[PDB]
Amino acid sequence: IPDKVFQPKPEDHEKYGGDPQNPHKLHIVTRIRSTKRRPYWEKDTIKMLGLQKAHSPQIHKNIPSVNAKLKVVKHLIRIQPLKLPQGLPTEETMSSTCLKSTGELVVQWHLKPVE
Amino acid sequence: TYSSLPDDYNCQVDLALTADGRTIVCYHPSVDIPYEHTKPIPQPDETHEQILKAKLEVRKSKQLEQGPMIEQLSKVFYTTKHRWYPHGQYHNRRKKLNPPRDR
Amino acid sequence: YPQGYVPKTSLSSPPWQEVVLPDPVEETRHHAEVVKRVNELIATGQYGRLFAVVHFASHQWKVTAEDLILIENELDIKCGERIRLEKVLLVGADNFTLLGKPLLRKELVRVEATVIEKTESWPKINMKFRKRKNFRKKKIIVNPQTILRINTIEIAPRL
Amino acid sequence: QSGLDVIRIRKPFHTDNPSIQGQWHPFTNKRTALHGLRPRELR
Amino acid sequence: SSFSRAPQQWATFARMWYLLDGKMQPPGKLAVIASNKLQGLNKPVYHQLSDCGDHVVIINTRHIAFSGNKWEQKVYSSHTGYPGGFRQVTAAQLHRKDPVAIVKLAIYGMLPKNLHRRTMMQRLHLFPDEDIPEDILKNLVEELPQPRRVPKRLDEYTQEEIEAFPRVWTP
RNA sequence: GUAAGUUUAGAUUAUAGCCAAAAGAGGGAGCUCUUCUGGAACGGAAAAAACCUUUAAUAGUGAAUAAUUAACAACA
């Protein structure tokens, strides 16, 4: 596959809402398919990545080695950029953290409807 | 005419969000049929048991044979003759003596 | 006929018919008027039997006076002790009902029930399919159980 | 445990007043006619 | 509410009689509706073992309309069970022999392939013409709107409609 | 990214598939072979060892989803 596939365009950035500068640090990956009937190399990568259970949240760094590994298993995973509206959680708030489906990890859970 | 469904058959439906907006309140007072839209009791001045006996009339050869009797029974209830036929002792004994009944 | 005029026909208009919703300002007045009557109804206690829908464990239980509910698990609560269910989404009255979004406020509705018995489940047979099944490859399931009796359902005019 | 027999329970819920607003019957939601005229009645 | 147990059971489990008009109506669309009414699927508490089917009365079956050329293209096949007992008849021929046969066959095929189908057919009443026994009318509870809206003919069109309709071109 | 690996000593058992799908070679149909890849539902493709969706198995009168036999005459 040509490298142009992984070279983004200005329109692509708008569609996916990703800024070319300050790229997202952490990837959110969940397995949505089975590795049965797949070649051994595909099976090995999934086990190494820890995505044994489907729909299992995993925190991984957006680094070339992880990026290379994720590309191999791209079709079996969903990639979402992590967002920290309130910043990194503190030690005291480590028990109050909650990750939303939108990709935002709130450090304080107030048990109030967003509405 | 705020209600989106007709209120004339079952009950008047009054839909209203609460002031806080946390609750949806439905008020459903029942509606009675108008007097003008009802029929009077039969003015002319017989028990259903008598009618049932009359329907299964005994006319030919005094009591009719089993087949005609089943056919007469089948016609009244719009059922098949197969339903009326009895069953053997084996299954009859198997029937539960004390079936449970709730509500 | 004016420019770009299309008379209504079978294919000019969709099978469905467009409707116009009522204006909001007057509609909001209708909302308050119904609420005011309802608050008086709750205050006047013009209701008898009530039914409430309560979500417990992974199940939703419609509840009424004298109802008996069986929970297929232990609760750790002694028998004869009254307990309050905290998750109620709907409560019904003779001529009116309240619907949570998705739950009502705790102040409006309070529901209490009592634990009657702690029990287990009658044996359940489990047998996996395999060649040469044999008769001794059998397992029984006697998972725990508990019994609850509904005691009271309470509402107040706190609209 | 209670003396109650331990066998399969068909329904986990027991209520003596299942209905509050009335049980549905065919005449429910059926619109009436003036004078209670039955269908096809010329009158 | 507040009714006695037995009367409440009687009313809820009671069977209703329905009237259907087949004039210029496709039997297939009617059959689908008829199956719903006959089987008792029109009730909110429908159950497979509750025998909640309802009586259906169909009239004007002689005047039914078939879309396309189904009159000449649809062939019904039956076998007597003896050698050479294979019979194939077109829809038009079947209607000529019996106006009600086509409607009954379609309903029977649409109905579930179970023992209850035979009982349901007993509850079904098919009349070639508008004539009905009076007692059936007393039994009849409601009539159902025709599934298909009948288009109007040129003569049926009102004079006012003709004036409203514009002349697209001038001859 | 991840947790096994090398050496020393003792010791056997297994060493015959099936079908699908790729790459070749005989060939010209199709076959006949050699090489690589995958499979063994309780779901689906009609019934369907071999194809598709499917990480194990537990009770519950809950919930969101995957594959999923159907599809909509011609002339400038």
Side-chain angles (χ1 to χ4, degrees):
Chain A
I1 309 307
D3 295 330
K4 64 95 178 178
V5 171
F6 281 87
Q7 295 162 29
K9 310 171 185 180
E11 287 70 11
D12 298 331
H13 288 286
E14 305 304 328
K15 179 207 173 156
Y16 304 114
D19 52 355
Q21 269 55 43
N22 189 353
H24 66 294
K25 284 217 286 178
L26 295 182
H27 294 297
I28 310 172
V29 286
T30 46
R31 181 171 71 81
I32 58 169
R33 287 205 272 137
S34 177
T35 43
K36 292 153 203 145
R37 311 171 163 282
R38 307 308 321 155
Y40 64 89
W41 54 83
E42 290 187 15
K43 280 168 157 83
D44 299 4
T45 56
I46 289 285
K47 294 162 49 48
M48 279 163 211
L49 285 163
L51 300 157
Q52 291 86 9
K53 198 192 70 66
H55 298 89
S56 79
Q58 299 300 321
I59 310 305
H60 282 295
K61 297 176 178 194
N62 176 11
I63 61 174
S65 296
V66 176
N67 282 6
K69 286 172 197 56
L70 261 55
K71 288 154 201 161
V72 167
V73 301
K74 66 181 79 180
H75 52 285
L76 314 171
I77 62 168
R78 185 219 176 196
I79 306 177
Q80 185 184 183
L82 182 66
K83 303 176 289 189
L84 291 178
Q86 307 143 36
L88 271 169
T90 62
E91 166 55 20
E92 54 267 18
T93 61
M94 207 76 69
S95 191
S96 79
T97 52
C98 170
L99 177 53
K100 310 294 190 280
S101 60
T102 57
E104 305 172 346
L105 171 64
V106 310
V107 307
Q108 274 274 336
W109 190 229
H110 308 286
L111 288 177
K112 292 139 195 174
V114 64
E115 203 69 3
Chain B
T1 311
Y2 306 90
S3 87
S4 63
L5 272 178
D7 285 330
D8 50 28
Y9 53 96
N10 182 354
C11 54
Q12 293 181 343
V13 169
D14 307 351
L15 300 179
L17 293 161
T18 47
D20 53 15
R22 305 202 205 186
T23 306
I24 301 169
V25 180
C26 298
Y27 175 51
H28 47 76
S30 302
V31 302
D32 282 5
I33 300 174
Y35 183 105
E36 319 302 313
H37 290 242
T38 61
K39 255 184 162 47
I41 48 167
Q43 285 77 342
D45 298 331
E46 186 69 14
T47 79
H48 197 57
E49 295 195 339
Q50 301 170 1
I51 299 167
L52 275 174
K53 289 145 203 175
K55 293 268 195 164
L56 305 170
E57 178 59 28
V58 55
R59 63 184 180 83
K60 186 170 193 54
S61 174
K62 290 185 180 68
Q63 199 264 331
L64 286 75
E65 293 92 21
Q66 293 189 354
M69 183 207 57
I70 285 176
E71 292 302 328
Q72 186 79 278
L73 274 164
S74 84
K75 284 186 289 292
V76 168
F77 292 110
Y78 298 86
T79 72
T80 74
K81 66 174 187 294
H82 307 75
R83 183 255 168 197
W84 307 92
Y85 288 117
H87 273 266
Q89 301 187 0
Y90 169 59
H91 307 298
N92 292 334
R93 298 157 173 271
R94 273 148 53 87
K95 182 159 192 137
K96 268 190 276 172
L97 305 174
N98 295 115
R101 185 267 189 190
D102 174 13
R103 76 162 78 260
Chain C
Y1 281 122
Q3 187 89 3
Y5 185 79
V6 184
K8 182 141 171 157
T9 65
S10 47
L11 284 187
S12 307
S13 176
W16 53 87
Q17 60 281 20
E18 180 270 0
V19 296
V20 166
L21 288 171
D23 60 347
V25 188
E26 299 174 38
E27 194 184 0
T28 58
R29 300 177 223 157
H30 162 250
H31 289 104
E33 196 279 331
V34 168
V35 166
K36 295 295 104 175
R37 296 187 301 170
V38 166
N39 189 358
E40 302 293 332
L41 280 160
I42 307 167
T44 46
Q46 292 177 23
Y47 51 75
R49 291 200 65 91
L50 311 172
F51 66 84
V53 170
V54 163
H55 183 294
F56 199 55
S58 182
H59 307 91
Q60 313 183 359
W61 316 79
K62 180 172 182 292
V63 169
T64 192
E66 310 152 3
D67 186 1
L68 283 170
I69 296 306
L70 175 84
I71 308 296
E72 209 281 317
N73 58 39
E74 67 95 20
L75 297 182
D76 211 330
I77 313 169
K78 297 137 204 166
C79 285
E81 182 172 2
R82 199 175 282 174
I83 304 292
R84 185 215 187 174
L85 311 179
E86 278 190 336
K87 303 198 151 142
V88 60
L89 291 78
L90 189 150
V91 59
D94 196 338
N95 287 299
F96 54 92
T97 57
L98 313 175
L99 315 169
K101 296 182 54 67
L103 286 145
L104 300 165
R105 285 185 283 116
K106 275 289 189 50
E107 291 78 10
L108 301 156
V109 183
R110 199 210 167 71
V111 177
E112 287 163 355
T114 289
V115 169
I116 302 316
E117 189 186 346
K118 304 171 74 68
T119 310
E120 56 281 357
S121 70
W122 81 281
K124 309 163 188 165
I125 293 161
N126 180 287
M127 189 151 183
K128 192 254 169 183
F129 72 94
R130 190 180 318 291
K131 69 183 288 298
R132 186 167 58 252
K133 291 182 174 72
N134 191 33
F135 169 85
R136 277 71 63 91
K137 268 152 59 196
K138 182 193 298 183
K139 211 256 185 172
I140 287 299
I141 307 293
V142 286
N143 297 127
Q145 289 180 329
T146 58
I147 304 189
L148 289 151
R149 172 167 289 282
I150 307 300
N151 290 111
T152 68
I153 303 180
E154 297 179 353
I155 53 173
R158 301 177 186 169
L159 289 170
Chain D
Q1 282 147 350
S2 164
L4 293 183
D5 308 333
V6 183
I7 59 182
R8 192 188 58 91
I9 297 172
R10 287 181 168 172
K11 271 181 269 181
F13 46 86
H14 162 234
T15 48
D16 293 350
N17 281 276
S19 171
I20 297 91
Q21 290 152 27
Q23 186 158 299
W24 177 99
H25 54 76
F27 290 123
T28 61
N29 301 334
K30 272 178 164 297
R31 70 189 55 263
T32 46
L34 187 57
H35 310 303
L37 290 191
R38 87 185 44 94
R40 299 291 187 185
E41 183 174 8
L42 301 173
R43 201 214 185 205
Chain E
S1 195
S2 299
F3 312 135
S4 298
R5 285 76 54 200
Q8 174 64 66
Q9 190 279 341
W10 184 265
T12 306
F13 267 98
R15 58 188 54 189
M16 323 303 285
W17 289 64
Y18 301 93
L19 176 59
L20 277 171
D21 187 335
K23 169 175 299 306
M24 283 279 187
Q25 289 307 300
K29 298 196 137 74
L30 280 168
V32 173
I33 302 165
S35 60
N36 176 355
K37 308 301 179 168
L38 280 167
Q39 300 176 231
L41 287 162
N42 63 38
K43 308 173 168 183
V45 300
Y46 171 85
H47 201 276
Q48 295 77 353
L49 314 163
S50 288
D51 194 27
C52 45
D54 286 326
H55 288 262
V56 172
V57 176
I58 309 189
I59 66 181
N60 287 295
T61 68
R62 174 169 287 108
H63 320 110
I64 58 168
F66 263 97
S67 47
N69 297 321
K70 289 173 186 173
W71 281 117
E72 286 70 20
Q73 282 165 336
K74 184 175 198 59
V75 167
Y76 293 72
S77 304
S78 59
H79 210 276
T80 69
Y82 298 90
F86 188 52
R87 312 277 155 256
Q88 285 184 302
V89 63
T90 72
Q93 294 163 1
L94 176 50
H95 196 63
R96 197 183 56 92
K97 180 64 69 179
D98 187 349
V100 169
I102 300 176
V103 168
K104 177 187 300 178
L105 287 194
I107 296 169
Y108 196 76
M110 286 205 188
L111 279 166
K113 307 304 189 286
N114 63 358
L115 289 181
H116 308 128
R117 174 168 53 165
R118 301 184 177 275
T119 317
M120 294 154 181
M121 295 300 276
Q122 304 323 304
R123 283 74 178 281
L124 175 62
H125 314 280
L126 307 174
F127 296 83
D129 286 323
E130 314 205 346
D131 292 342
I132 311 163
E134 173 53 22
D135 74 324
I136 300 308
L137 307 194
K138 296 209 161 75
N139 308 323
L140 273 175
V141 180
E142 195 203 355
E143 198 272 332
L144 307 179
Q146 282 193 353
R148 159 167 177 277
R149 187 211 64 71
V150 188
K152 285 193 291 184
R153 288 182 265 88
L154 278 185
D155 54 358
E156 286 175 293
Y157 272 97
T158 73
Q159 174 43 233
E160 305 89 318
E161 277 169 319
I162 299 167
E163 303 154 18
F165 199 82
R167 283 295 305 186
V168 179
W169 70 295
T170 181

